[PDB]
Design a protein around this ligand. Sequence first.
Ligand SMILES: [Co+2]
Length: 9
Amino acid sequence: LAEALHWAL
Ligand SMILES: [Co+2]
């Protein structure tokens, strides 16, 4: 989930 957010941001 941390990386999903990194990608999104
Ligand atoms: Co990352």
